[PDB]
Design a protein around this motif. Structure first.
Motif, PDB file in Angstrom:
ATOM      1  N   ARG A   1      10.178 -11.810  25.083  1.00 34.15           N
ATOM      2  CA  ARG A   1       9.209 -12.932  25.164  1.00 34.15           C
ATOM      3  C   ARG A   1       7.855 -12.430  25.657  1.00 34.15           C
ATOM      4  NH1 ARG A   1      11.442 -12.645  30.380  1.00 34.15           N
ATOM      5  NH2 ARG A   1       9.924 -13.214  32.005  1.00 34.15           N
ATOM      6  N   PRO A   2       6.800 -13.126  25.270  1.00 38.19           N
ATOM      7  CA  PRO A   2       5.464 -12.696  25.608  1.00 38.19           C
ATOM      8  C   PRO A   2       4.980 -13.265  26.930  1.00 38.19           C
ATOM      9  CG  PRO A   2       5.341 -14.621  24.120  1.00 38.19           C
ATOM     10  CD  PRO A   2       6.842 -14.245  24.301  1.00 38.19           C
ATOM     11  N   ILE A   3       4.094 -12.521  27.577  1.00 40.08           N
ATOM     12  CA  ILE A   3       3.235 -13.063  28.594  1.00 40.08           C
ATOM     13  C   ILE A   3       1.838 -12.964  27.982  1.00 40.08           C
ATOM     14  CG2 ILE A   3       2.228 -12.934  30.817  1.00 40.08           C
ATOM     15  CD1 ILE A   3       5.137 -13.658  31.021  1.00 40.08           C
ATOM     16  N   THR A   4       1.253 -14.113  27.714  1.00 39.79           N
ATOM     17  CA  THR A   4       0.009 -14.152  26.978  1.00 39.79           C
ATOM     18  C   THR A   4      -1.159 -14.196  28.010  1.00 39.79           C
ATOM     19  OG1 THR A   4       0.190 -16.568  26.523  1.00 39.79           O
ATOM     20  CG2 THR A   4       1.069 -15.104  24.797  1.00 39.79           C
ATOM     21  N   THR A   5      -2.321 -13.679  27.601  1.00 40.00           N
ATOM     22  CA  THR A   5      -3.519 -13.755  28.440  1.00 40.00           C
ATOM     23  C   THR A   5      -4.794 -13.412  27.668  1.00 40.00           C
ATOM     24  OG1 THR A   5      -4.640 -12.989  30.464  1.00 40.00           O
ATOM     25  CG2 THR A   5      -2.939 -11.568  29.587  1.00 40.00           C
ATOM     26  N   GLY A   6      -5.886 -14.033  28.115  1.00 39.26           N
ATOM     27  CA  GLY A   6      -7.173 -14.149  27.411  1.00 39.26           C
ATOM     28  C   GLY A   6      -7.600 -13.223  26.287  1.00 39.26           C
ATOM     29  N   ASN A   7      -8.226 -12.115  26.661  1.00 44.13           N
ATOM     30  CA  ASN A   7      -8.760 -11.159  25.692  1.00 44.13           C
ATOM     31  C   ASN A   7      -7.746 -10.051  25.356  1.00 44.13           C
ATOM     32  OD1 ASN A   7     -10.693  -9.428  24.201  1.00 44.13           O
ATOM     33  ND2 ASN A   7     -12.271 -10.670  25.242  1.00 44.13           N
ATOM     34  N   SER A   8      -6.470 -10.300  25.666  1.00 42.60           N
ATOM     35  CA  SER A   8      -5.465  -9.263  25.700  1.00 42.60           C
ATOM     36  C   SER A   8      -4.359  -9.440  24.611  1.00 42.60           C
ATOM     37  CB  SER A   8      -4.844  -9.283  27.120  1.00 42.60           C
ATOM     38  OG  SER A   8      -3.809  -8.318  27.258  1.00 42.60           O
ATOM     39  N   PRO A   9      -3.786  -8.312  24.071  1.00 38.16           N
ATOM     40  CA  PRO A   9      -2.540  -8.404  23.282  1.00 38.16           C
ATOM     41  C   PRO A   9      -1.502  -8.935  24.264  1.00 38.16           C
ATOM     42  CG  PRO A   9      -2.961  -6.097  23.997  1.00 38.16           C
ATOM     43  CD  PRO A   9      -4.246  -6.913  24.193  1.00 38.16           C
ATOM     44  N   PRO A  10      -0.420  -9.579  23.793  1.00 40.93           N
ATOM     45  CA  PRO A  10       0.553 -10.009  24.835  1.00 40.93           C
ATOM     46  C   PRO A  10       1.199  -8.780  25.537  1.00 40.93           C
ATOM     47  CG  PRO A  10       1.482 -10.182  22.629  1.00 40.93           C
ATOM     48  CD  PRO A  10       0.023  -9.874  22.432  1.00 40.93           C
ATOM     49  N   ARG A  11       1.780  -8.990  26.719  1.00 43.25           N
ATOM     50  CA  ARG A  11       2.728  -8.013  27.327  1.00 43.25           C
ATOM     51  C   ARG A  11       4.120  -8.578  27.034  1.00 43.25           C
ATOM     52  NH1 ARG A  11       2.124  -2.947  28.610  1.00 43.25           N
ATOM     53  NH2 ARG A  11       0.280  -3.506  29.878  1.00 43.25           N
ATOM     54  N   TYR A  12       4.993  -7.824  26.358  1.00 36.38           N
ATOM     55  CA  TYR A  12       6.324  -8.350  26.115  1.00 36.38           C
ATOM     56  C   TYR A  12       7.273  -7.941  27.243  1.00 36.38           C
ATOM     57  CZ  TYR A  12       4.689  -9.551  21.507  1.00 36.38           C
ATOM     58  OH  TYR A  12       4.041 -10.113  20.424  1.00 36.38           O
ATOM     59  N   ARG A  13       8.050  -8.935  27.665  1.00 35.28           N
ATOM     60  CA  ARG A  13       9.086  -8.735  28.676  1.00 35.28           C
ATOM     61  C   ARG A  13      10.417  -8.839  27.986  1.00 35.28           C
ATOM     62  NH1 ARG A  13       7.274  -8.320  34.334  1.00 35.28           N
ATOM     63  NH2 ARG A  13       9.243  -9.431  34.763  1.00 35.28           N
ATOM     64  N   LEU A  14      11.392  -8.009  28.410  1.00 31.67           N
ATOM     65  CA  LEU A  14      12.654  -7.972  27.705  1.00 31.67           C
ATOM     66  C   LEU A  14      13.796  -8.055  28.707  1.00 31.67           C
ATOM     67  CD1 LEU A  14      10.557  -5.677  26.299  1.00 31.67           C
ATOM     68  CD2 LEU A  14      12.472  -5.362  24.761  1.00 31.67           C
ATOM     69  N   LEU A  15      14.803  -8.799  28.299  1.00 30.54           N
ATOM     70  CA  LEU A  15      16.082  -8.816  28.986  1.00 30.54           C
ATOM     71  C   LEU A  15      16.993  -7.908  28.113  1.00 30.54           C
ATOM     72  CD1 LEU A  15      17.460 -12.248  30.224  1.00 30.54           C
ATOM     73  CD2 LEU A  15      18.672 -10.040  30.364  1.00 30.54           C
ATOM     74  N   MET A  16      17.516  -6.803  28.699  1.00 32.51           N
ATOM     75  CA  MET A  16      18.222  -5.780  27.943  1.00 32.51           C
ATOM     76  C   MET A  16      19.638  -5.650  28.494  1.00 32.51           C
ATOM     77  SD  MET A  16      15.776  -4.478  26.222  1.00 32.51           S
ATOM     78  CE  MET A  16      16.426  -2.946  25.498  1.00 32.51           C
ATOM     79  N   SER A  17      20.523  -5.178  27.649  1.00 36.25           N
ATOM     80  CA  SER A  17      21.952  -4.943  28.031  1.00 36.25           C
ATOM     81  C   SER A  17      22.338  -3.500  27.732  1.00 36.25           C
ATOM     82  CB  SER A  17      22.849  -5.886  27.257  1.00 36.25           C
ATOM     83  OG  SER A  17      24.194  -5.466  27.434  1.00 36.25           O
ATOM     84  N   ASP A  18      23.133  -2.888  28.626  1.00 37.58           N
ATOM     85  CA  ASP A  18      23.693  -1.558  28.312  1.00 37.58           C
ATOM     86  C   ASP A  18      25.208  -1.727  28.019  1.00 37.58           C
ATOM     87  OD1 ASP A  18      24.954  -1.904  30.729  1.00 37.58           O
ATOM     88  OD2 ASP A  18      24.037  -0.129  31.708  1.00 37.58           O
TER      89      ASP A  18
END
Length: 118
Positions: free
Chosen positions: A29-46
């Motif tokens: 999922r993204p964390i969106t912000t003004g003049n910026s590409p999103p930062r994607y955050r991930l929930l991962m499994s091993d």
């Protein structure tokens, strides 16, 4: 490939940055912000544990935008950093990866990983 059970532990507990773990993406999922590409955050499994504190390097954004890296896909992590926040929460930043298998080649979560704690 087979998911790298105990990789999340190795990362969080042993300070291991040498391993090249095979992980499933549970969610992205993204964390969106003004003049910026999103930062994607991930929930991962091993396959053993899930961990919510993954973030993606901006260099890997196109893989998300072009639908390669998506919720349920399996990837191999080639390079990552572990940072300790001010908060104290630790975060793992995925710097290099390859998608091994599309989200479509499997249905929803693999196995029954348990949320990690530390």
């Amino acid at each position: 490939g087979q998911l790298s059970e105990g990789a999340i532990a190795a990362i969080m507990q042993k300070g291991d940055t040498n391993i090249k773990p095979i992980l499933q993406v549970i969610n992205i999922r993204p964390i969106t912000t003004g003049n910026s590409p999103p930062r994607y955050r991930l929930l991962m499994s091993d396959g053993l544990n899930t961990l919510s504190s993954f973030m993606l390097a901006t260099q890997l954004n196109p893989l998300v935008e072009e639908e390669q890296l998506s919720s349920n896909c399996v990837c191999q992590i080639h390079r990552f950093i572990v940072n300790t926040l001010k908060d104290g929460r630790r975060v793992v930043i995925l710097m290099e990866l390859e998608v091994l298998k599309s989200a479509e080649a499997v249905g929803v979560k693999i196995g029954n990983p348990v949320p990690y704690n530390e």
